[PDB]
């Protein structure tokens, strides 16, 4: 089975936030619950009734014909929770497994056929995933800040200004909010075209149509890989500076052994009248007081936060003397790509990479040494060796359109030279409706 | 009238090419374009000049200005004091600034109410242009042509680049074009006729 | 492909000066490429041949 293939399913909270109000607004019966005695024909009648291909799950183990129907028709089951999901399905083949699934964003547009009530896409979810979880006051701070940037006097917004109670702030959070009539009890009523005006039907995130149209293009821009120039993680490996390409990531050598960093791996210990920072290899169990003579380790450091200066220094010393590879994942960095004539203006000692606060943004520099000209035949030999420690874990030249605009010889291309993508030049046409289009590839 | 838009000529984009040069490289031969072809192809040739070490595609700092709060001196948009800790000053060079940058970028795009009006435009006679340029040109074009690597064709003195760009431009699936074009909206009026460039 | 005539920019050149005995430490090691070299007097190729 392809990762795309299987039984689509989502948590009830997602259904409530995103699918349910839309169903309410389209005047269709609420989707049927699926007990263990649900025929595929019933699910079909439900799906054609709601025009949505969604069924809530109620209770019991679902029979296999229903499962094959749900799978063949890509129907989205809604679940109370993700505990013991396999227990909810009959397994004629026992192929289903709690660990065998593929989490992925599924745009509402792939479900609903009515474009009128769908303003965004997956891009907003991705952008939100970038955001730290915010307390309501942090949300208010964000909104007040954006208001400050756009020269709005946001004073008293979101606040009750009482004569005797003073000012009181209420939460500005109201994600997915809709305008709705309430019964005098205070409880919400479902939208009714008969009494409520059409404008209150769906709120469109309280944005102007044109603002939405533009918001779409902006979302495409924001999630473009070229703009995604904030990188996570740095491999630390003691190697000679051979490769011109900035985006070089040394491979871990064949003999190396992966080891997650943990405080427990390092200890004080006696060794030849010294209290050396012994390291114990998790496989062999062997203790190694000296940074020299340690087994080839590919150590991963997900979080530096508790690490002692002694241990960090010992890890670096192992990188250098025992030839460790240490992938530090906690690091986030911008990455300027220097050209050989401009050198490295900024420097990062190993200590600072190992001790910088989490959540601070490092600014690494990486030479593109492809434009270094050949040495003279009579330049004195270098007895020494230029070395390098820091490397990216991911491609860094994401913004790079072209490279090495010079001739090797007069006619040959320099190795690693980069032509502009054809797409940068395609300037096709306007669509029938005015959207930009690339030229047709094949004539048909 | 309500000022719903921001009429402007010669629009600036969200993305622009940035370029780093190694100045020690310089072709010995001096290419001699016609004055017209230099009027069109010039800003391109000048920017992707021989010796360009890298050519990046950055968000246009001129558009995502400090007035939006965005800083772009690094690889990424960065906006201070948007996503912050409460009860303490936010640390300098905090990573969350990147996310704020994206928000302010998204927002700034969401609110771009620019409405292009045609700027000054030349209409070269065909004979005044090299044929390769003339095939791309469509009668008129803005005097402020931006840059495009497609213009480098038969103009860059770098051989492999010319060969590669010529390949992509001779593919059926990609056709560079510049200047006034036959839009579906041609001859539609709105106090003034709409046209495509 | 051609030989550089202008003075090229070079990585910083730390001279390690190893002796019979020493205490190696790698705190504040540089991360950028660096030319560690062992001897102080490496300008040995003096006699230019016209």
């Amino acid at each position: 089975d392809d990762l795309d293939e299987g039984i689509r399913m989502t948590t009830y909270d997602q259904y409530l936030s995103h699918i349910r109000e839309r169903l309410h607004i389209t005047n269709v019966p609420d989707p049927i619950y699926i007990t263990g005695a649900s025929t595929p024909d019933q699910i079909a009648a439900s799906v054609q009734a709601t025009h949505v291909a969604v069924v809530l799950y109620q209770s019991g183990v679902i029979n296999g014909p229903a499962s094959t129907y749900l799978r063949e028709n890509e129907v989205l089951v809604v679940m109370p929770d993700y505990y013991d999901v396999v227990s909810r399905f009959a397994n004629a083949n026992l192929q289903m497994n709690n660990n065998r699934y593929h989490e992925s964003v599924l745009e509402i547009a792939d479900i609903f056929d009515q474009a009128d009530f769908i303003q965004t896409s997956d891009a907003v979810r991705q952008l939100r995933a970038l955001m730290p979880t915010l307390s309501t006051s942090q949300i208010r701070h964000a909104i007040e800040r954006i208001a400050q940037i756009t020269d709005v006097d946001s004073t008293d917004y979101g606040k009750l200004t009482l004569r005797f109670l003073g000012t009181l702030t209420r939460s500005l959070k109201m994600q997915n909010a809709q305008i709705r009539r309430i019964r005098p009890d205070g409880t919400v009523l479902r939208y009714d075209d008969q009494i409520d005006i059409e404008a209150f039907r769906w709120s469109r995130y309280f944005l102007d149509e044109l603002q939405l149209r533009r918001l779409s293009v902006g979302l495409r821009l924001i999630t473009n890989p070229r703009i995604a120039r904030r990188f996570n993680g740095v491999r630390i490996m003691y190697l000679t500076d051979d490769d011109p390409d900035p985006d070089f990531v040394p491979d871990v050598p064949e003999g190396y052994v992966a080891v997650q960093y943990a405080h427990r791996l390092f200890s004080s210990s006696l060794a030849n009248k010294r209290n050396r920072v012994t390291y114990t290899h998790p496989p062999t169990g062997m203790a190694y007081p000296s940074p020299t003579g340690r087994p080839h380790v590919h150590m991963t450091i997900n979080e530096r936060a508790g690490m002692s200066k002694l241990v960090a220094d010992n890890i670096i010393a192992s990188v250098i003397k025992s030839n460790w590879v240490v992938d530090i994942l906690d690091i986030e960095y911008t990455a300027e790509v220097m050209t050989p004539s401009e050198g490295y203006t900024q420097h990062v000692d190993a200590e600072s990479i190992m001790t910088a606060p989490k959540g601070k943004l490092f600014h690494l520099q990486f030479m593109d040494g492809l434009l270094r000209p050949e040495p003279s035949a009579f330049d004195p030999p270098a007895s020494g060796e230029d070395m390098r420690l820091i490397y990216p874990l991911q491609p860094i030249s994401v913004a790079r359109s072209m490279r090495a605009i010079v001739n090797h010889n007069e006619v040959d291309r320099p190795r690693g030279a980069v032509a502009p993508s054809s797409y940068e030049m395609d300037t096709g046409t306007l669509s029938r409706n005015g959207d930009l289009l690339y030229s047709p590839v094949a004539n048909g | 009238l309500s000022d719903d838009f921001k009429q402007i000529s010669d629009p600036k984009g969200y993305l622009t090419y940035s370029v780093k040069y190694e100045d020690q490289f310089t072709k010995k031969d001096k290419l001699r374009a016609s004055e017209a072809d230099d009027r069109i192809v010039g800003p391109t040739v000048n920017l992707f000049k021989y010796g360009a070490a890298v050519v990046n595609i950055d968000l246009n700092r001129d558009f995502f200005d400090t007035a939006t709060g965005i800083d772009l001196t690094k690889g990424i948009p960065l906006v201070q004091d948007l996503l912050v800790p409460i009860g303490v000053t936010a640390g300098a060079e905090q990573s969350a600034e990147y996310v704020s940058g994206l928000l302010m970028v998204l927002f700034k795009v969401m609110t771009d109410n620019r409405l292009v009006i045609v700027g000054e435009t030349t209409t070269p006679m065909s004979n005044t242009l090299s044929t390769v340029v003339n095939n791309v040109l469509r009668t008129t074009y803005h005097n402020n042509v931006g840059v495009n690597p497609a213009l480098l064709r038969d103009f860059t003195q770098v051989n492999w680049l010319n060969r590669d760009i010529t390949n992509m431009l001779q593919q059926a699936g990609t056709k560079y074009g510049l200047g006034l074009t036959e839009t579906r909206l041609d001859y539609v009026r709105l106090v003034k006729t709409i046209v495509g460039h | 492909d051609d030989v550089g005539i202008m003075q090229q920019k070079k990585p910083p050149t730390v001279v390690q000066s190893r002796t019979d005995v020493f205490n190696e430490q790698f705190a504040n090691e540089a991360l950028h490429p660096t030319t560690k070299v062992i001897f102080n007097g490496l300008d040995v190729n003096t006699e230019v041949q016209p």
Binding site: P340 | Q7, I8, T16, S18, K20 | -
Partner: peptide, 26 residues
């Protein structure tokens, strides 16, 4: 002479639209 490096980036020119009083067509 020392080898050197230098950058460039395409300039903005997005002026507000000119207010002409001449007209092209009858």
């Amino acid at each position: 002479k020392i080898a050197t490096a230098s950058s460039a980036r395409q300039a903005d020119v997005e002026k507000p639209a000119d207010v002409t009083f001449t007209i092209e067509n009858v």
